[PDB]
């Protein structure tokens, strides 16, 4: 076991699917998985694993900011084997045509944060993710006849910032969601030597003030889950 | 109710004693307050409020790191009145003569974070705590009979650091703990005028490498939430 | 005509590849391209513009560093109407797996440049290529036999650095190839509105010491070209 | 002897008040202390030794800006035995209700200074007072009917500022006072393990041009002598 | 040889004037020195070494921005005894009583670039030129009646800045002009031991926006030229 | 009257002497001045007005460090129409063939501090003097017999700093000597559009401590002191 997580080496998949909230992951888990098994519980943060077509798979939330998931998807990878993480969360718009409910694929992620900068002594580090995880989510997609838009994502410190130009900023260079924690999963990733993917539903949009709303939101979310799980299946073959 | 708070104004007393870990506060609550019911669930971040020695009091946890906790305090201070917040956790000990189950006060917040830089035109901003409650802390810690050490804290966005060598300069500069939210806390406080204090019992001693495991340790967590309870008293007064 | 290249809207087909060295882009034009024409030449910097397998095709030099291809790109951008760049240059290896003559994609852009703190209020902004282009380029190189690396490259404006260990931090995140220009066309692209992707050829080996040598150029140098112009026709279907 | 004092071991009190001005040293030195001895006059700046209701202090004047209070407190320190240094002097004030010639102690102290920033790694160092020293100053001031405002102070390297839009963000965050060594002086009782106070009165409002008397201005400077040499005899007991 | 440039020592004279066009170098060897002779032609970077009134001269293109100049002036310094480089180009203006014309000489540079940063430990590295170079430059501009600006220039990495707020602030400060490579220039001739000088003529102007066509314009850029070739001659004394 | 200056416009003359401590402004005055009056007295900080052969001059200390030197030459321009600021002091070498005792004339001032980076947009500015003002020095050194040399200066805003390594990046790039105000100094007067320059003696090698009498110090103040006068005669032709 480790600091955060209370369960021992083989208790997770080698693939772990990680919304923000803990009641999502377990939502998941009941949803999509068979055989669905608590492996963790610590400060709440429910863990599970799973069977999805046969595949071994598990869910867990890794609370909100980089800080947060930077310890969990730490843990994940040093002391209980995981290969792959897919963050499945929400996210802001900032662009006009980008609506909400929209799926986004993460190929790479800005940050205000300074946890890359103090990792690459104070340079520009690239925070991307794994070019096959983001092809076979691309794919998944267009087999389930979902749209994906394939591009940047914002991983912010602040969720209530005081600096509103900064969205113009963002609008400029095409930033399709902004969101709290992609930067420091790829930062991760590329220090622990694995492979990471985030993905977000378009939940309210900075600009027109709408967060989620009526039963769209379970039905977009599953969604993105699908798409999640069948890109691991296209990755095992 | 607020993005991430399922409640109404009223739901929360005007004084609100945070821990790191919801399942901690569920902890406080049936511990210590009298007649408590739970105000919040939303993401598993468990919310009560109840009374001690009559007065009314509430206890919440923020989750882990800068970002996480903003949020909250954030949305406590500017839509449920809340006025104080008394941060109540653990940090890692960095000098030789800081023991283990030692109080440790916050006055102030060094901090890897660039939270602050984004607030104060990229200066350095004192992350302070409130004067009075600093004050209440010690007397109420007299009056049990404890030695409360006031000074310096620092607030990592990195649990797992890339560098070892911080260590030897907070210690040069007499850094009492380590932990991850004080920072964030204070800036907050400042930006929307409310009040705030950081309480810590040191759980670990990064320098000759001492966890912990017996009921003399949570003797003393016990001890920091009844200094925490009964500084609010004084505060009344 | 714009200040660094004396032609007129219509000169240049909508995609461009762009070498480092002005004598490169000359014998591209006539190795690859057919009823190739002369359209530029100012301060030396050679443009080409033919027709590969009925496609129009155009190719010219952008010299070496940042500062240098900026100008080019941008003006190409906005006085030409060309839609997409494609950088064809040399790199230097970092990670010892990664030998001579290998084929590496720049999905992502590190860089040590300010360029894009100046663009982005000094925060991180993720210098990405154009997803489907590094799909394209993919493609083309599995239909082509050819081996391809996908990942980060490192953008330096120093090919004389005096910090040492940044190639250690470099090797430790995985950056697949040192070059000079990558982390500023894809802030260009961005900025402008375009697409765009870099693609090298590994030379020398900034650990070992041994550039290229032999004829090994030439046939590796036109594995690139090829797989750069096959990109594009599999990008028109 | 050092560099910038010509002096023995011995010739300083533990305890060390320092006006900014050097002529106030020798004020100090005749209006509240007795058996007064001369100690230093290198480049001016004098230097006195006495008793004060039998406590053995000294005094001294420390010079404008954080480079010149930190050549005397560091020598002081290191090289005559000094345990605490007490800065007396004036500021300029940005909030409303912070009246003209009211009493301020700095807890703590912003500044847009770079001198603590090389000596915590590039990091957020919260430049703090030594909290007894803090509460010493308040009881005093009770004692003798002052009512004194206890929070942050700003340490600016330019009295004039090319910016003016500052200080709109230094009230927005409750910055008391405006003056020139307290972040400085707080960052060298750090480095070498000594304690430090700033206490100020406002002796001008960056706002609306107000007025006082020659008179009311010696009165207010020796109520603010009085404060600093009562708080050192209550940290005594 | 060396990377970049494909001679053998002795090809070069002591001292290189170095424009920013080669086909400018060609145009130099052809109008003012004696038996002249390619020495390079390596990415078509055109190298000339001659002899002016029986002084061996040497004069080569060095590319537009810092990372481009920065390699040949140090492959030349370290590699061909290369003591003196003296940059010959043009510059945009910036003052209003700053004409067109008018030959300006970089006492100094201010930059927009980090390279200087990354070589003096992230501090301020004033990059000046060599005093003595600059004295024979004024003086052999006297020779010759021409009204020589001594002062500061301003080295862009992006000739076309999403910032035009710079500007006034370049004129606040007084910049005479601004160009591409000055900055760097100097701070190799600092890390390698050797000397050199920037000399510019204003080709535009900024402020009014003036371009430039005439058989004036080509007599003050010869003018520069002559300053640059008697100032080495001067030298020599 | 300015906050540190009691004295009206037309007192001081049109240029100015400043030394660092005081008691040397009147040492000046009285050894090479006639006809002085008395100008200034507040803080201790004597200034004085008088003639060197016909020519109408005033000095004045300026403190230690840039805060307070900037408090001073911002008055005197801004207020008391002075065009010219000449600062004369003493300086610590680390380069071996610098002798104890030479004279050292700042063409350029490099710094750790953040003032001018605060004034130019965060951007490097090259703090430099004015180069006719450099050159009369030289001149007027050279007329008397005098051998100076002329390069950067090194500003420090701590003379105690925590950082030993820069000596060594500073003797890397040819630093001639180090003190605390040039850099500062030569903003101010680009700020407000005056001249100044700094000329120092070196008074300590940070290397191999040396030894000289009081003797040879005081007529090497004296050498200074009469290359400052006669280079402002020989400006004035
Ligand atoms: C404004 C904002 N910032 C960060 N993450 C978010 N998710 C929804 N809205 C968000
Ligand atoms: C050892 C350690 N390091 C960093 N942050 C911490 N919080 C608690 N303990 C910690
Ligand atoms: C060391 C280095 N830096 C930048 N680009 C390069 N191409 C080859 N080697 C290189
Ligand atoms: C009025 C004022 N303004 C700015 N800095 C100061 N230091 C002391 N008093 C000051
Ligand atoms: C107008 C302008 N802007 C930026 N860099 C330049 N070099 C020459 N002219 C320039
Ligand atoms: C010897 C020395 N060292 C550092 N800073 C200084 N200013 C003046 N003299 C100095």
Redesign the interface.
């Given at each position: 076991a480790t600091p955060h997580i209370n369960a021992e080496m083989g208790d997770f998949a080698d693939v772990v699917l990680m919304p923000?909230?803990?009641?999502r992951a377990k939502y998941i888990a009941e949803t999509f998985l068979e055989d669905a098994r608590e492996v963790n519980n610590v400060?709440?943060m429910?863990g599970f694993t799973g069977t999805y077509k046969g595949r071994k798979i598990s869910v867990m939330?890794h609370?909100?900011?980089?800080?947060?998931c930077?310890?969990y998807t730490?843990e994940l990878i040093t002391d209980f084997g995981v290969k792959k993480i897919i963050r499945v969360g929400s996210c802001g718009a900032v662009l006009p045509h980008v609506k909400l409910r929209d799926v986004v694929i993460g190929?790479?992620?800005?940050?205000?944060?300074?946890?890359?900068?103090?990792?690459?002594?104070?340079?520009?580090?690239?925070?991307?993710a794994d070019?096959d995880m983001?092809?076979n989510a691309?794919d998944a997609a267009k087999a389930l006849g979902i749209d994906a838009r394939?591009?940047?994502l914002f991983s912010?410190?602040?969720?209530?910032?005081?600096?509103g130009?900064?969205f113009d900023?963002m609008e400029?260079?095409?930033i399709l969601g902004v969101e709290?924690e992609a930067?420091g999963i790829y930062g991760v990733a590329?220090?622990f030597g694995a492979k990471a993917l985030t993905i977000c539903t378009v939940s309210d949009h900075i600009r027109t003030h709408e967060?989620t709303t009526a039963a769209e939101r379970q039905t977009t979310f599953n969604d993105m889950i699908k798409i999640a799980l069948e890109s691991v299946l296209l990755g095992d073959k």
């Open positions: 923000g909230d803990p009641l400060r709440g429910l939330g609370g909100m900011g980089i800080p947060s930077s310890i730490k190929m790479g992620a800005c940050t205000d944060s300074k946890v890359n900068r103090i990792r690459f002594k104070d340079h520009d580090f690239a925070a991307i070019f983001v092809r691309v394939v591009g940047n912010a410190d602040l969720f209530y910032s005081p600096d130009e900064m900023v400029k260079y095409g709290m930067a590329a220090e967060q």
